[PDB]
Amino acid sequence: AEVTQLSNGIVVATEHNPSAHTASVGVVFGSGAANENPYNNGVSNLWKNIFLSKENSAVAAKEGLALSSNISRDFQSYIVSSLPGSTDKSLDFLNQSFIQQKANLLSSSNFEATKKSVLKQVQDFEENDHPNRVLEHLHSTAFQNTPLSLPTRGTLESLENLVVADLESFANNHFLNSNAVVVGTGNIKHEDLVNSIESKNLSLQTGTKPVLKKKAAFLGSEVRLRDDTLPKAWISLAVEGEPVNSPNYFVAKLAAQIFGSYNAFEPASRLQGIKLLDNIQEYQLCDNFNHFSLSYKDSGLWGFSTATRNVTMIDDLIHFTLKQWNRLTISVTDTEVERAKSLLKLQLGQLYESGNPVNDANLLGAEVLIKGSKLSLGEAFKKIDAITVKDVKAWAGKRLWDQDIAIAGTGQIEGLLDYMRIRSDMSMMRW
Amino acid sequence: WGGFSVSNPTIQRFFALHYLVPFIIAAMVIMHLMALHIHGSSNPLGITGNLDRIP
Ligand code: HEM
Ligand SMILES: CCCCCCCCCCCCCCC(=O)OCCCOP(=O)(O)OC[C@@H](O)COP(=O)(O)OCCCOC(C)=O
């Protein structure tokens, strides 16, 4: 596809697809959980559910409109969807919710029922969803005392002390035209969207959001949440990685694809060309693992997550996995690098060429907000095809060899050994 | 003594006894460590140590 950006006072981006049967229109702001403090942690999660509340959604469903929203660390989104010949109504609804009249939504009755609904989501998340809350605690110890540590949903202790005035203060400082991108995906022409905006003289708020004092800093650390009543052990482990607008962005993504993802109960996942699986399958040390490479405006993370029921062989799983990471600096084969090139292109093709216009609106707005434009998928494939074996060794010797780590765990983790027995496995030194 | 006083038979047998017994001590030390492995060591507080262990 082909993107098209403009600036008439308002930044308008679009990605037309004539094959789609729908159209999405929305606005993406360049502020998220990393632009908050510990006192108001969760105020962006309440704006999501106020936008999706029942009396607001009822007004939309009478004209054939569906609503969505998403809160992350670096951005926030508010999308409206419609049939292709009804995109003029999508913009009017968005006009009387952000540019005008966001006081009818913050009434007393609408704010108390919404608050009670959010306190029950975050409570069930902390007691039932173990893989995702251990990955949240990883961000909280790795980036402690910096903005990138705060959870995106909020906490139960900070949510209870939020009143209406906290919602209005956060909007005056962040929902600004200088911090906003208007997006359009699916079956919508680029020129029909901009002329519709020019015929209304819209302006959210002018600009100059706050300054954000501290930068993100990685600290080697651990946090353990032991619970012997649960039936598994959930563990995550990472080093410091690459931010966006880094030269090593795609080299870190390719090195995670070398070790990849595993499911013990799927037969075809046991046959992948991954050397680590010859050690794990002898005694069945885990149920699943997945390797990630996450990237933000200021820093990143590189590592893996696992879940297991073999609570007596945890130390052999962590040991064998970290000995394969060492091979990226010493001994990594040309065959392993060509496999990972092909599967990474398939992974990026499914993410960017899905059918949903709502997913494409979130990717487009976040990219334009953070580098001014969007890289094509044909240009990204050429960068991936130009990575050599020497490039992986240079990246790993800087980022992996003899470097500090962050750890988080929950469940039956008595068999997870101390920090320094694990820190020592990051360098071979039988060498 | 091997005779009627501390004499040459006494000194020659004391040296041969003296080389042996250090090797009997080495076997009592192995048995000593085996009895420590089944319950482990104690601690200066005198309570259980199974809640906080390091390698
Ligand atoms: C060649 C002589 C000996 C050797 C090599 C030896 C070796 C050891 C070692 C390595 C330990 C574990 C670490 C420690 O507790 O310091 C230990 C513990 C112990 N030894 Fe010895 N030992 C010897 C003689 C003795 C003697 C003569 C006694 C008592 C009459 C004794 C009684 C104990 C006890 C009660 C413990 C356990 C202490 C505790 O866990 O609190 N050992 N020994
Ligand atoms: C007729 C009955 C016996 C027949 C054969 C019995 C074989 C003995 C051990 C076989 C069983 C091993 C499996 C575990 C078990 O249940 O037994 C414990 C073995 C003895 O452990 P340990 O040697 O006291 O360790 C004690 C540790 O400190 C390791 O020992 P280390 O200090 O390295 O010792 C070397 C020092 C001197 O040794 C010499 C010269 O003999």
Q: Which residues lie closer than 8 Å to A385 by C-beta, 6 or more apart?
A: A341
d(CA A424, CA A8) in angstroms, rounded, equals 56
DSSP structure class, residue A77:
E
Q: A34 near A73, Cβ under 8 Å?
A: yes
Q: Cβ distance A174 to A29 under 8 Å? A: yes
DSSP letter string over A346-402?
HHHHHHHS-S-HHHHHHHHHHHHHHHSS---HHHHHHHHTT--HHHHHHHHHHHTTT
Pairing of strands A76-82, A66-71: antiparallel
Q: Which two three-digit tokens encode residue A126?
A: 């902390």
Return all residues near A76 (Cβ < 8 A) that are at least 6 apart: A28, A29, A31, A32, A44, A47, A48, A69, A70
Is there a binding annotation on residue B18?
yes
Q: In sequence order, what E strands does A187-299 have? A: 221-226, 233-240, 261-263, 288-295
Residue A99 is classified by DSSP as I
Of A399, A389, A400, nearest to A427 (Cα)? A400
Can you tell me which atom of ligand 2 is nearest the CA of B27? 41
Fold identical between A1-202 and A208-431?
yes
Q: What is the rounded CA–CA span in Å between residue A23 and residue A356?
A: 10
Task: Name the resolution in angstroms.
Answer: 2.5
Q: How far is CA A163 from CA A107, A143, A155, A159, in A?
A: 11, 28, 15, 9
Is A275 an interface residue toward B (CB < 8 Å)?
no
Q: Which chain A residue has the Cα nearest residue B52?
A: A414
Q: How far is CA A60 from CA A29, A72, A342, in A?
A: 22, 25, 43
For A279, counting Cβ atoms within 10 Å of its Cβ (0-12 exposed, 13-18 middle, 19+ buried), the class is middle
Order of strands, sheet of A288-295, starting from the edge strand that comes earlier in the sequence: A221-226, A406-411, A233-240, A300-308, A288-295, A261-263
Alpha-carbon Rg of chain B, whole angstroms? 22
Architecture per CATH, domain A1-202, reads as 2-Layer Sandwich (3.30)
- Ligand 1: centre distance to CA B10 (Å): 34
Give the sign of the dihedral formed by CA A185, CA A189, CA A191, CA A195: negative
Element counts in chain B: helices (H) and strands (E)? 1, 0
- For testing contact with chain A, the best of B50, B51, B52, B54 (most A CBs within 10 A): B54
Structure tokens at A16: 């037309």
- Residues from chain A contacting residue B55 (CB–CB below 8 Å): 417-418, 421
Ligand 1 atom 33, closest CA: B32
Please name the helix (run of DSSP H) or strand (run of DSSP E) that holds residue A82, with its range, or none: strand A76-82
Specify the amino acid at residue A197. Answer: I
N residues, chain A:
431
The answer, yes or no, to whether any atom of ligand 1 lies below 6 A from the CB of B29, is: yes
Closest CA relative to residue A212, chosen from A41, A81, A32: A32
Distance CA A141, CA A78 (A): 30
Parallel, antiparallel or unpaired: strands A406-411 and A221-226: parallel
In the beta sheet, which residues pair with residue A13?
Answer: A5
Secondary structure (3-state) at A185: strand
- The strand pair at A406-411 and A66-71 is best described as unpaired
User: What span, in angstroms and rounded, lies between the C-alpha atoms of A10 and A177?
Assistant: 7
Supply angle C-alpha A147, A32, A150, rounded to 5.
Answer: 35
Number of C-alpha atoms within 13 angstroms, CB side, residue A325?
29
**In testing the pocket of ligand 1, which one of B32, B42, B48 has its CB within 8 Å of the most ligand atoms?**
B32
Q: How far apart are CA A3 and CA A379, in angstroms?
A: 13
Report the DSSP pairing between strands A11-16 and A66-71. unpaired
Percent helix, strand and coil across chain B, each rounded to 5?
Answer: 55, 0, 45
Ligand nearest, relative to CA of residue B29 = 1
Q: Closest Cα to atom 8, ligand 1: which residue?
A: B33
Its sign, for the CA torsion A119, A123, A125, A128, is negative
> Amino acid identity, residue A343?
L
- Quick check: CB of B41 below 6 Å from ligand 1? yes
Which residues are CB-contacts of A362 (< 8 A; sequence separation ≥ 6)? A28, A70, A77, A79
Give the list of residues 6+ apart from residue A260 with CB closer than 8 angstroms, or none. A272, A274, A290, A291, A343
How many of the other CB atoms lie within 10 Å of CB of A290? 17
One-letter amino acid identity for A310?
N
Is B39 marked within a binding site?
A: no
Domain A208-431 CATH (choose: 3.20.20.10, 2.40.50.100, 3.100.10.20, 3.30.830.10): 3.30.830.10
B32 lines ligand 1 (CB under 6 A): yes
- In sequence order, what are the residues at sequence separation of 6 or more whose Cβ sits closer than 8 angstroms to the Cβ of residue A55? A110
Nearest in space to A366 (alpha carbons), one of A30, A102, A6, A123: A30
Task: Give which of A265, A255, A284 is closest to A344, Cα–Cα.
Answer: A255
Q: Which two tokens stand for residue A212?
A: 């954000």
H-helix or E-strand spanning residue A307: strand A300-308
CA dihedral B18→B23→B28→B30, nearest 10 degrees, is 160
The SS3 call for residue A208 is coil
Q: Is there a contact between A186 and A17 (Cβ–Cβ < 8 Å)?
A: yes
Long-range contacts of A329-337 (CB under 8 A, 24+ apart): A329/A393, A329/A396, A329/A397, A329/A400, A329/A401, A330/A428, A330/A431, A332/A258, A332/A389, A332/A392, A332/A393, A333/A389, A334/A389, A336/A258, A336/A273, A337/A254, A337/A258, A337/A387, A337/A388, A337/A389, A337/A392
Question: Which stretch of DSSP H or E encloses residue A16?
Answer: strand A11-16
The token pair at A363 is 């990717």
Maximum CA pair distance of chain B? 64
Is the CB of residue A70 less than 8 Å from the CB of residue A24? no
Task: Transcribe A57-75 into DSSP letters.
Answer: HHHHHTTT-EEEEEE-SS-
DSSP code, position A84: G
CA distance linking residue A203 with residue A200, whole number of Å: 9
Q: Using N-to-C axis directions, what is the helix angle for A389-399 and A249-256, rounded to 10°?
A: 90
- Structure determined by: cryo-EM
Supply the DSSP string of B19-38, one letter for each residue.
HHHHHHHHHHHHHHHHHHHT
Angle between helical axes of A164-174 and A43-51 (0-180°, round to 10): 90
Strand-pairing partners, residue A23, are: A82, A186
Cα A352 to chain centroid distance, Å, stands at 15
- Ligand 2 atom 30: the closest Cα is on which residue? B30
Hey, is the C-beta of A419 within 8 angstroms of any chain B C-beta?
no
A228 in contact with B, Cβ within 8 Å: no
Alpha carbon separation from B18 to A333, B1, B11, B13, B14 (Å, rounded):
62, 15, 11, 8, 6
Nearest CA in chain A to B50: A414
Is the separation of the CB atoms in A406 and A218 below 8 Å?
Answer: yes
Rounded-to-integer distance, Cα A375 and Cα A352, Å: 11
A418 near B CB under 8 A: yes
Query: Phi/psi of residue A33, each to 5°?
Result: -65, -25
Q: Does A421 touch chain B (CB under 8 A)?
A: yes
On whether any CB of chain B is under 8 Å from the CB of A226, the answer is no
Distances (CA, A) of A211 to A36, A174, A224, A373: 12, 11, 34, 23
> Do residues A63 and A93 touch, judged by C-beta distance below 8 A?
yes
Structural domain spans, chain A: 1-202, 208-431
Q: How far apart are CA A365 and CA B29, in angstroms?
A: 72
Pocket test for ligand 2, best of B30, B34, B37, B38 (most atoms within 8 A of CB): B30
Q: Which of A230, A285, A293, A295 lies closest to A262, judged by CA?
A: A285
Contacts of B27 (CB under 8 A, 6+ apart): none
